[PDB]
Structure 1
Amino acid sequence: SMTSHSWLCDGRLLCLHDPSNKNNWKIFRECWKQGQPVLVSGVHKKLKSELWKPEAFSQEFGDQDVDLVNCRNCAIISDVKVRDFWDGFEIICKRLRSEDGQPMVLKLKDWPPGEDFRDMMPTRFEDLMENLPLPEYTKRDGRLNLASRLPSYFVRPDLGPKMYNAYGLITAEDRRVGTTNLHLDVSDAVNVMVYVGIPIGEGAHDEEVLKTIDEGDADEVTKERIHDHKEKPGALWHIYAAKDAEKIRELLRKVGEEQGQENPPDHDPIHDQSWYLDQTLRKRLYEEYGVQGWAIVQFLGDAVFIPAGAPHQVHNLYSCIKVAEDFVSPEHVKHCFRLT
């Protein structure tokens, strides 16, 4: 039967089922006031599927100059054409190769650049903004979005949205690497999975995806979602409560010291965006510091709501196209205030 919602993370994560239900705010706002992330499924069913394909981005924008990142070693690939990224998104035999002759796992950096999404892609902008869940919070002019209403005593978000495009991590060694490293944002955000590309070329790697979700601490119901094998999994997230950010900084200063980094005692390992918490580090955080997070698998059409101040990291399972919008809810406005 159709239902309004369900729970993941053993009851700690709200999952809303109808992105355009006018009564979602009634269920959402209690979880949101407590500092929790929220998942909303089904957004892909509201979008024009032809606007979100890798082959359309390559056809329309392929002659633009861009920089890529090698996710395995953080090497920058400077001033290449964006078609060199898009044409290898699903077809492994077309990917740029490292010196060892393996196809690289690449992230497309800052594309579209800065605040240029709306100017470059007006039809995409309209399709996304008109279908975002919790629109009183997430729309630029929503009643519960304070972004346009705050004085300079508050850090205001840039004009969005922002696109996040990267290949999937493939090997056992790749399990310890991030697509986006651990960091925090002073605004709230909603991140929507608009496309998942699963290769079939070098496509017997669906076996090491099963294990990665396991090692990632995903709950039994999310696995039922994986094990049932009807929905396409895009990315594994770990999110931590804003109240636990300093304890995570204490762990990362201790590990940086153990590994021979020479850091001042006050430096900020979260702001540095240099760490990915692998299974070893997540266990150490729980056991040594008492900190539990939320392990979230973002499937095609899932919208992840990330609270202001919450440390978070992202690991792509398959090739992903994500689109994110920042907002400032009244519940979390303290996180962008410039005093005390």
Structure 2
Amino acid sequence: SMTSHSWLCDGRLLCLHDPSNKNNWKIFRECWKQGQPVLVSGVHKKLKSELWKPEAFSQEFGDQDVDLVNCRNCAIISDVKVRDFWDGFEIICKRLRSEDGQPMVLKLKDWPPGEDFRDMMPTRFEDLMENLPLPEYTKRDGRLNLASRLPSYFVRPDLGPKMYNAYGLITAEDRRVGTTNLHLDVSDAVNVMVYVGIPIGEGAHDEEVLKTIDEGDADEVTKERIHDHKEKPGALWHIYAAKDAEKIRELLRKVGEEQGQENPPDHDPIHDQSWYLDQTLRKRLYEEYGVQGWAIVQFLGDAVFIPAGAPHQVHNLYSCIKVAEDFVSPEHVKHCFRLT
């Protein structure tokens, strides 16, 4: 039976089922006001699937110059062609190799660059913006998006959207690495999974993905969603409430000191974007500081809503294309005010 919604994270996470239901706001706004993230499934079914394929990005834009990041060691690969990233997205025998001779796990940095998505990809821009869920919050001109309506006393988001493209992490050692390290944003954001690429060549890689979700602390309903196939899992998220951000800074200052970093007592380990909370660190956060988070598996066509001020990290299970839009809801406008 079709239903309006269900729960994940043992009742702590709202999952909306119909991305274009005109009554979603009634269920959404209660959870959102409490500072919780929200998941909306099914956005892929609303999009033109041919616009979101890795082979189309390589064909249309492959001669552009870009920088990559090696996710395993943070090394920058400078001034290569964007086809050198796209042609290895799913086919492992085509990836750039590290000195050890292994294929690299790469992230495509700042592409399209700055605010240039709309100019570079006008048809993709239309297809995404016309199909975003909770459109009074998420459209540039929505009635509940204050982005265009605030004076300079508020930090305003850049013009979006922003594309996030990276390979999947593969090995047991990779389980402790982020695709995007722990950080926070002063705006709200909606992040849509528009494509998941499950490779071939070193395909048969299904088993290390199950251990990563399990050790990642994913709930039994998410695990059921994983274990009976049907939907493709893209990325494992951990999100923390904005009210817990200072307790997380205290843990990361204690760990930086234990590991012989030499940091001033006030430095900001979340703003530094240098940490990934692995299973050891997540357990220490819970046991030593009393802080629980939300472990979220983002499948193809899932939209993750991330509240302003909420610390969050992302670990790709397979190769992912994500597109995100920032917005300023009235519920969370305090997080971008420049005084007090």
Structure 1 residue 204: Cα displacement: 1.3
Secondary structure of the 1:315 match is: strand
Secondary structure of the 2:77 match is: strand
Structure 1 residue 312: Cα displacement: 0.1
Secondary structure of the 2:145 match is: coil
Superposed CA deviations along residues 288-314 of structure 1, whole A, max 9, x for unmatched, are 000000000000000000000000000
Secondary structure of the 1:209 match is: helix
Secondary structure of the 2:31 match is: helix
Distance 1:121 1:149 in 2: 26
Q: How high is the TM-score relative to the length of structure 1?
A: 1.00
Secondary structure of the 2:123 match is: helix
Secondary structure of the 1:217 match is: coil
Structure 1 residue 135: Cα displacement: 0.0
Distance 2:288 2:301 in 1: 36
Secondary structure of the 1:268 match is: coil
Unaligned 5+ runs, structure 1 = none
Aligned to 1:278: 278
Distance 2:44 2:87 in 1: 23
Aligned to 1:310: 310
Give me the identity figure in percent: 100
Structure 1 residue 196: Cα displacement: 0.0
Moved runs in structure 1, 4+ residues, more than 2 A?
A: none
1:142-161 matched pairs, under 5 angstroms: 142-161=142-161
Secondary structure of the 2:315 match is: strand
Structure 1 residue 253: Cα displacement: 0.1
Distance 2:233 2:258 in 1: 35
Structure 1 residue 200: Cα displacement: 2.0
Superposed CA deviations along residues 24-50 of structure 1, whole A, max 9, x for unmatched, are 000000000000000000000000000
RMSD, aligned CA: 0.2
Structure 1 residue 244: Cα displacement: 0.1
* More divergent stretch after superposition (196-205 vs 314-323): 196-205
Distance 2:204 2:257 in 1: 40
Structure 1 residue 206: Cα displacement: 0.8
Superposed CA deviations along residues 132-171 of structure 1, whole A, max 9, x for unmatched, are 0000000000000000000000000000000000000000
Distance 2:312 2:176 in 1: 15
Secondary structure of the 1:182 match is: strand
Distance 1:286 1:233 in 2: 26
Superposed CA deviations along residues 189-219 of structure 1, whole A, max 9, x for unmatched, are 0000000000022101111001000000000
Superposed CA deviations along residues 265-287 of structure 1, whole A, max 9, x for unmatched, are 00000000000000000000000
Superposed CA deviations along residues 216-261 of structure 1, whole A, max 9, x for unmatched, are 0000000000011110000000000000000000000000000000
Structure 1 residue 20: Cα displacement: 0.1
Unaligned 5+ runs, structure 2 = none
**Alignment: residue pair count:** 340
Distance 2:181 2:209 in 1: 19
Secondary structure of the 1:255 match is: helix
Structure 1 residue 91: Cα displacement: 0.0
Distance 1:3 1:228 in 2: 20
Distance 2:213 2:254 in 1: 27
Distance 1:227 1:334 in 2: 41
Aligned to 1:33: 33
Distance 2:200 2:217 in 1: 27
Superposed CA deviations along residues 98-125 of structure 1, whole A, max 9, x for unmatched, are 0000000000000000000000000000
Secondary structure of the 2:178 match is: coil
Q: How high is the TM-score relative to the length of structure 2?
A: 1.00
Distance 1:317 1:223 in 2: 14
Distance 1:228 1:180 in 2: 28
Superposed CA deviations along residues 28-84 of structure 1, whole A, max 9, x for unmatched, are 000000000000000000000000000000000000000000000000000000000
